[PDB]
Amino acid sequence: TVYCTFDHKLSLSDISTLCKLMNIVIPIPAHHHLIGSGNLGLYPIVSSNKDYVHIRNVLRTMVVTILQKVEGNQLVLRKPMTGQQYAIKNTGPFPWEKGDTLTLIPPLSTHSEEKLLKLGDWELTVPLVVPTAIAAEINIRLLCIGLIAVHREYNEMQTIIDELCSIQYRDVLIKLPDIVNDKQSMYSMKTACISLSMITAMAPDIVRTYIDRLTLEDHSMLLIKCQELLSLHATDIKDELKKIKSVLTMIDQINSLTNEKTYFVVCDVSADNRMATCIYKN
Amino acid sequence: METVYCTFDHKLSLSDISTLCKLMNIVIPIPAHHHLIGSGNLGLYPIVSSNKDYVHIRNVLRTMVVTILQKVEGNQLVLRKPMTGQQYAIKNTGPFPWEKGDTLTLIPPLSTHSEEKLLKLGDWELTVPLVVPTAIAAEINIRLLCIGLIAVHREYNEMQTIIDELCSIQYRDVLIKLPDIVNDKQSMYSMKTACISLSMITAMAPDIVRTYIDRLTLEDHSMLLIKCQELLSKRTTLSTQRCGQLHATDIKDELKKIKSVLTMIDQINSLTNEKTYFVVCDVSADNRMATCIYKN
Amino acid sequence: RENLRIAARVFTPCELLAPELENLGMLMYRFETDVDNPKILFVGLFFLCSNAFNVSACVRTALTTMYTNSMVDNVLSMINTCKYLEDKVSLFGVTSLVSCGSSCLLSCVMQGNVYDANKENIHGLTVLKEIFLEPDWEPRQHSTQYVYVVHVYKEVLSKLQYGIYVVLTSFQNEDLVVDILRQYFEKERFLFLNYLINSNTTLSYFGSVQRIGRCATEDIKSGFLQYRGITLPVIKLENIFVDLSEKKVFV
Amino acid sequence: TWIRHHVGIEKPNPSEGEALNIITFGGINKNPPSILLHGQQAICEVIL
Amino acid sequence: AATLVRTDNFDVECLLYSSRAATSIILDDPTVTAEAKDIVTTYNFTQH
Amino acid sequence: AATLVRTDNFDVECLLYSSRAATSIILDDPTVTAEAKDIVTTYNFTQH
Structure with a gap:
């Protein structure tokens, strides 16, 4: 369990967006019991040259967590264990056929701006999940x-x-x-x-x-x-x-x-296909 | 949830129940789509001999969910899927002997049509991948x-x-x-x-x-x-003679x-x-079953 | 009570385990044999680091004097007459419970932390100090490191000489580890790009890396082993969650 | 080569595009200087 | 010519004054949690 | 001449009938399995 605290009070629109964003893999480099605004997500590296393969290499180096149970400004991230079952909300624009293996990919910059978070010169850059x-x-x-x-x-x-x-x-x-x-x-x-x-x-x-x-x-x-x-x-x-x-x-x-490297193995998929269950960690 | 129940289409003969009791521990690949019938999408019968390429066979056998038989009820198969890093027990199917510490894997069965065809229940049969060292x-x-x-x-x-x-x-x-x-x-x-x-x-x-x-x-x-x-x-000592274009x-x-x-x-x-589907820790007596641990 | 560690009982002739019957926690190797009565035969990590090429001549002759009898001479001859190394011998696990009978009984841990029973004095992996190196961007990066064992071959104009490396890295990803290892190993790699064509011995790679398992950063401590007074510098990992994975080869 | 030889730089500074772009990521592969007396120093440069 | 620049770091002990009751502090009961690994159990006290 | 075949997909609701007591079901008493973790203690349970 890694608790995140941004030290900055968020609004009801922000808590509504994080309630929409619950159960998503976010990578952290820190490996502590506490993280803050500075190390959460992928923004603390995507200002250095924006090279896709550079983000891909350091994203291979990162340590992945799952979003859980946002209580206002505090933000739980479960460190998910090897081979156990976990629920993931998807972000990659895909139809997600079950049983395929999944990897974790840098965010392909769409033309539309993100609506996830932009707060105080800090965004929440979430890397996508894709099939292998x-x-x-x-x-x-x-x-x-x-x-x-x-x-x-x-x-x-x-x-x-x-x-x-x-x-x-x-x-x-x-x-x-x-x-x-x-x-x-x-x-x-x-x-x-x-x-x-x-x-x-x-x-x-x-x-x-x-x-x-x-x-x-x-x-x-x-x-x-x-x-x-x-x-x-x-x-x-x-x-x-x-x-x-x-x-x-x-x-x-x-x-x-x-x-x-395959990071997830899908078993059950919702009909909306926003959330899916996996049994894997590397 | 943890286990899986399969229900056969037809009733089982006395020799068929005896065959399942002979085979009470085995690996069975099942696709991701959970089919509750005990004649469809189990043992990979529907994949070989209907859509055959040997790259498709190896690909699908890599991607299928391995699941071991645990107990046979009066009508249903109890199939426990393995958790990674834990111990399970495998009864020995392959011809090749198991020794301790060996890494095991699943190859497609060398499907000569002289085999005894363990189950054969109305055009449907059961073929298992061979558990074999790497x-x-x-x-x-x-x-x-x-x-x-x-x-x-x-x-x-x-x-x-x-x-x-x-x-x-x-x-x-x-x-x-x-x-x-x-x-x-x-x-x-x-x-x-x-x-x-x-x-x-x-x-x-x-x-x-x-x-x-x-x-x-x-x-x-x-x-x-x-x-x-x-x-x-070394290999092409005379290089680019006619040049083609x-x-x-x-x-x-x-x-x-x-x-x-x-x-x-x-x-x-x-x-x-x-991939090493199993790492066998110890081998039981007479080489008929073996307690192993599950990986990948 | 509760255990959750995976062990295997082991019978091995007592000639091969000469200091490893005294210092608990060592890597063990399976060596299958065409002789049918000992089908499997179990090999010390230092016993194979004898004819590893990384080891300097002083350390090599010192542990050869720890490793001189007729049975070990015949087994080393068998290992040398094997064509390659990595799939005629193999990684097996970590030593615990030497019994030292006639044909000595060894427990060996596949998964979990290294302890016999009652969970007193949980042992640790003992690696020779010459045979490891940590090629990484920052050494001992933030926290606990994965320990891998790499087999690397070399060819000095007659035959093949194998070499035993142990790497300690913060990287979990095997692709990142083989990418930093090719940067470490490029020179002899190009020597094998010369060699593997003219060779007829059935091998296909330069080396292979395989995970032992987890360690802890604050649990790395130095020391030495001694058997018959031969002081031998080792680096003792203290608490190890043994997590074997597949061999990953690289050319 | 002549500019590097006069300003006193090691002649092999390239390494497969900066160690496969980790010296693009930047860091230390050299031994830091073997004798040290007073700690840290760094002097930048403006032409005038 | 050139304006060489350089920065230097100093070891400075440095005192603080504050008026009384300048800021208030609210604190939970500390929460106790446990993680039971196979050889140790790590106990963790968090306090907000 | 040419004959042209077509697959058309349809969503059809199906009426259903059953007799007075068509099946008899046998229901387990549900057994609350208390899984304990660091934060959330998910009390999963089943019925057979």
Whole structure:
């Protein structure tokens, strides 16, 4: 239990907004029994350069809590234990099909201003909760923006970004503007580049043959699309096992790049789909 | 709440109640949608043999809620779902022996159609995932991928004996034959999305890494540049002879190549890892059941 | 009463546990064996830190003199003739209740704090001082740290040499930990990007990290162990909620 | 290189975009100076 | 030329006056709570 | 020619009938399980 106290008296509109906002994950860095206005939420970091991946890294470092039982200016945050059941109100604009794993993502800046809190040069920046599929999708897009923006053209950076950025998952359009192009993608691409070099050097003889053998036997239309992208074996089988194991491990590494740690596992969903129950903590 | 009650559609025979009493502890995967019928959405019968991909099978088996049988009533199944970090008891189903401290996991059943098919109640049956150690799970994954790769391959006069040497595995003096034979497709699982995606990764890697390493080394990288020169030059010693297009590529082309090669990895996310569903603490006598703890 | 800790009774021949029959709280390793009568055989952390490459020659020969008999010589030969290390030996837990019989009985804790019974003198994990390092942005950041064990290999032109590291970090996230470990380990990593192609031994990575469990920041204290007068500097974690997780490899 | 050599800076200051942008986040990797007598000092600079 | 600036921190003991009954203090009964871990029980007294 | 098929979704209320005493139900006495925590002591209970 972490009690928050803002030291500043809030109005009835503020207590109505927090009553609307009850049962939401808020991350804290402090790990004390007491927190205040300075450490609550994500505003004490989102003034430093506003970089999405920077917020993502420190948000990985943060310690997550659940809002509970606001008694006026005092604000209970439960520290939720491992694998126990907890009720979460959602903020991500999604339809939230049950049983999927959930991660915790930096807030994608919508054009409309937030109505959560703005009080005395301090807002309540709440990070969103998303499914792991669209989380990995966003991380793919981050890595891809760096792969393209290491390459340099004039009036083509905008041509890549405006086509790529607006994505749709479960009838929801989101976008990520103003990428600073830091070297974050360069390191997290550099180990990918290393691993793709290893996939090249360690990939077996069966597999790139397996394309041509599959195509020369039979054909399918998605195989013809893969062909568009494309354009003796005398008992070496333990070597083949080892090479396929190495290629699989490189794919595990590049998957561990774009993967985000699942923070929640959904069991029951309300019909309004504002609150859902989970049984997980990392 | 803590437990789950399933109700069978039909009454149970005497041999069927005897089968459930033989199987009174087992893992059962259930989907997230709580279906109260004891014939629908339990044991994963509705997922294999109705929608089969072997990446879909591995994905859904990863995402399903494991739940262990506890007690059989006169009509209903009592199914307790595990809490993480606590002890439970598992009766042994897999062929491979359990020893103490082993990490356990759930692989899909090697579904030859010669099994005894534990329940068979009017076109509905019960197939359980095999509780198996983790090194075995990696090994069986790689052997199944090897069979699915070399099965499509033609004009090998050694094809029957190399499929035999793939299907023969051995681990702690318990042999099993892998059912991925000469492609009867009883349950071959067909692994076509998996094999095409693996070969797209091993296909798209060298030219995307070539288009990157041909760029921006005016500073001393000297840790990736010459390293990737050696890495590319071992496997492809003769590099870029005919050139295909003679080096006229698009920024959108490299965009699409990067996006596809990063999408296929998160498609083969299912064959990426295996999670330790159980860490067995002690093994009971005669290796028929074992008390374990639950993780993930 | 109440316990809530998870233990396992253990039979191991008494030759291998030479100082670890005296100082309670040590990491233990499972070593499966193709010999069918001892299917599993249990290995001391310091016993494998013998042929770890991090350990300097003085500490290595000192604990080799703590670790010289015929049975240990044969077991070290078996470990060296194993191709890789990390899945022929394996992490197992923390020592409590040495019995020292003929074939000695060991309790070993999987989860929870390290205590036999009656909850007097709750023991702690004992790590050799050479074999750990804390790569982090700020050392001992705010509060309690997660303790991980990392196996790292090295290749000096003949064979593979394994190396045993222990990291202590405030980061819980395994992705953040492997991202700071690649920054620590990049040099020998590029050496293995050279090596793993020309190698034919079945391995696929540079190292792997696995969580032991929680510690407490104010409960880290220095000291030494001594067996037959061999003073050996150790850093003793005091109260440990043992929380094993999966192995996470990195190349 | 010549400017750094004359003003007395270590020639490898870059490290993969500032240690993968944690020296963008800013901090200490160096040993602080081995001898110290009077505590803290920091002198800024305006050109005129 | 240059106007070099610098700040310096001083160790200052520093006294306070206050008139009597300047501010009032209301306080609850302190609340007692317990957390029972597997090896210790942490007791916590909060007072508002 | 061309024949064109269509799925249409409908929300339908269903009338329901039952006999005089169609089922007989057997009700547990409810057993108040007192869970204790630091702040809230949720007293969950069940009926079988």
